[PDB]
Amino acid sequence: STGSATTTPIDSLDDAYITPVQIGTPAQTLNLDFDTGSSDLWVFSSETTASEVDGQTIYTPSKSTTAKLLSGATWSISYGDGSSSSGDVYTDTVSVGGLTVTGQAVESAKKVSSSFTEDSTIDGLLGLAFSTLNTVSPTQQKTFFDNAKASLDSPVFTADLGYHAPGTYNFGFIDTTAYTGSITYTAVSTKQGFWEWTSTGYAVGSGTFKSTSIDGIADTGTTLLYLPATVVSAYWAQVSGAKSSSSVGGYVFPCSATLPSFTFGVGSARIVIPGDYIDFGPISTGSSSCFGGIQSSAGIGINIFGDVALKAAFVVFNGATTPTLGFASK
Ligand SMILES: NCc1ccc(C(F)(F)F)cc1
Ligand SMILES: NCc1ccc(C(F)(F)F)cc1
């Protein structure tokens, strides 16, 4: 079987993408952030502290005839940005675009950090990294993808994120009408639990392609592109007036400038990120300084191919026994 769902940017900057997901019987529809950088399906719920909820749709297990409390199980997660949440665990039926999984672990948030409370458009996360990163204790739980793998026609899902426009998450099949040319596949290391791969190099604008290995993760749950300091310096050196700002915490540039494109290598193929994709607008309302979509990974410890890069391509997450990542222009 297969599944297909539309994903929609939450704001005018493509800061995140939400996808409707049906939980429980009868269905309770929540808009979740599909995150290939984590492995927990957690939701705002009727158990979440009342002061920590500001407009989100909540999951109510007491109204679901298929929800079962997973006795003794707890979860606690901390994200690379300092976000955090925790609670208990239910099992319930979960459907994504027609694709249904029974007995999926649904982690009910009892406490959420402020960054989640202030985001009224995101009702929770659906993790799509490898199940070894799941935080449920004492019994680790499988992701939605891992539980659906056996029933899928093909053990793959694809991300087709839009630039200021809706996109598509497909489960179980590859839409050959959604990309141009061929798909270039590259090896994935699962040793850290991520969709970790190695890019073959980069180029800035119309400049020479620099062949160099960049190890990083494909993360739909991260907004920006985080690359080594040498690469990021070479990019912003081509933008007049650009500078790294300690008070802002990243590279900023004059909003009147035009940004060059950024190319990254996938094997022998090249994915081109248009310069417009790197513009994330004024650092504050009315400011003439704009925030850059390519930032240094030095403070993070790992390079992250976030939405800025991924939305420039059709991306195949091949969860075969030897997992691979496929990239294609679109
Ligand atoms: N999108 C989930 C995520 C967030 C942060 C990280 C970090 F910081 F650990 F790399 C990995 C995955
Ligand atoms: N990378 C996972 C993630 C996704 C969204 C958020 C936000 F936007 F809610 F802060 C935090 C962490």
Swiss-Prot record:
Belongs to the peptidase A1 family. The active site is at residues 35, 199. It catalyses: Hydrolysis of proteins with specificity similar to that of pepsin A, prefers hydrophobic residues at P1 and P1', but does not cleave 14-Ala-|-Leu-15 in the B chain of insulin or Z-Glu-Tyr. Clots milk. It is an enzyme of class 3 (hydrolase). It comes from the Eukaryota. This is Endothiapepsin. GO terms for molecular function: aspartic-type endopeptidase activity. One of its GO terms (biological process) is proteolysis. Residues 17-328 form the Peptidase A1 domain. The keyword Signal applies. The chain holds residues 90 to 419 of 419 of the full protein. The keyword Hydrolase applies. Keywords: Aspartyl protease, Disulfide bond, Hydrolase, Protease, Signal, Zymogen. Its EC number is 3.4.23.22.
